[PDB]
């Protein structure tokens, strides 16, 4: 954590913002990661997240989900292209998913990491299982669903200490968001990694779409964004 403070300070001085939100963040009018959501802004500069959430650059907070190479046909042979699917997060309350393309693997990886920061979202965590009523943010607070292509995903709250009962792609995505225990059910073709990952991402995003009362926040221990002990 100490290193990332000075890293964020270093990036902040040598950055020339190009957009309105970048100008606000450079001037110090916006100081916390939570202040850029829920008001319709556009996010086009990756330095915003570097300044506000410096720990998305740690090696342990990034994941290369998949690498594929695809072919376009021409009269002079086959032209090869790389597609990389990647994700980042802070292991507390924020997560992003991105795809990058390039002529070689390194360029594709760099672009995929770059686009994942621009697609960042914040989620809600809690405890809603019938056999664990502990009010601590270790799972999803209620059953949620998401879909992409032919893939359907349903996430179900689980007891503390159970683990992530889901395929590996879901394991990595849910781990980067700060979730420890969950049950799941799926339909469709999960071997298509892109659609699987996007479906889990949509299911996580849909925790913000469920109406809740002030009693429920107390009951399920619902936390938005950073846990903040």
């Amino acid at each position: 954590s100490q290193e990332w403070k000075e890293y964020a300070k270093r990036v902040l001085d040598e950055w020339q913002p190009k957009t309105k939100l970048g100008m606000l963040v450079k001037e110090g009018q916006i100081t916390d990661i939570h202040e850029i959501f829920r008001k319709g802004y556009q996010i086009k500069e990756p330095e915003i997240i570097d300044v506000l959430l410096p720990e998305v650059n740690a090696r342990e907070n990034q994941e290369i989900l998949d690498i594929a190479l695809t072919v376009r046909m021409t009269d002079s042979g086959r032209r090869v292209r790389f597609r990389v699917l990647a994700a980042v997060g802070n292991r507390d309350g924020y997560v992003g998913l991105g795809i990058g393309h390039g002529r070689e693997v390194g360029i594709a990886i760099r672009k995929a990491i770059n686009y994942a920061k621009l697609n960042i979202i914040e989620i809600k965590r809690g405890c809603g299982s019938w056999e664990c009523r502990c009010r601590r943010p270790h799972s999803v607070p209620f059953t949620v669903e998401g879909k992409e292509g032919s893939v359907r995903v349903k996430l179900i709250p689980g007891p503390r200490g159970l683990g992530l009962v889901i395929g590996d792609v879901g394991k990595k995505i849910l781990r980067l968001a700060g979730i420890q225990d969950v049950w799941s059910q799926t339909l469709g073709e999960t071997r298509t990694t892109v659609n699987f990952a996007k479906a889990v991402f949509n299911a996580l995003y849909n925790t913000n779409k469920v109406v809740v009362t002030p009693e429920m926040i107390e009951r399920y221990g619902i936390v938005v964004g950073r846990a903040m002990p």
Binding site: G128, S129, W130, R133, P141, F142, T143, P157, V210, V211, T213, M216, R219, Y220
Partner: protein, 129 residues
């Protein structure tokens, strides 16, 4: 033909709240629909409602507040004993106390929390959350 007035009412409500309607008219009214509306209002899922008389079965006018995730009828009307509510909750609801099941008992129509408190069973007829 028309087979079930209560299912029509609940599907109409859940269709209307997804496009942001502020009021609805339930066209065939009945006493059972009135009971379900009373139980829903007690828990804050709807606003005020009223009965309008034509020469026919009558109409209900209901105010919506944008507080319903989903509402539906249960068919068939399964009998349930006084200590078996958990599995129906897992079948229909999203978390351990999220929303209500609406139960018809020989002491009236009530939510499954009140029925569990009194220690009696009955028939499942609807769910709202």
């Amino acid at each position: 033909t028309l087979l079930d007035p209560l299912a029509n009412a609940l599907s109409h409500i859940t269709n209307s709240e997804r496009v942001g309607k502020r009021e609805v008219y339930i066209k065939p009214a009945s006493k059972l629909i009135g009971e379900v509306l009373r139980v829903m209002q007690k828990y804050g899922y709807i606003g005020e409602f009223e009965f309008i008389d034509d020469g026919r079965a009558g109409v209900y006018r209901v105010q919506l507040l944008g507080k319903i995730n989903k509402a539906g009828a249960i068919k068939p009307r399964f009998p349930v004993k006084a200590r078996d509510y958990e599995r129906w909750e897992k079948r229909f609801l999203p978390a351990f106390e999220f929303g209500i099941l609406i139960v018809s008992t020989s002491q009236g129509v009530m939510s499954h929390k009140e029925a569990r408190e009194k220690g009696i069973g009955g028939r499942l007829i609807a769910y709202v959350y």
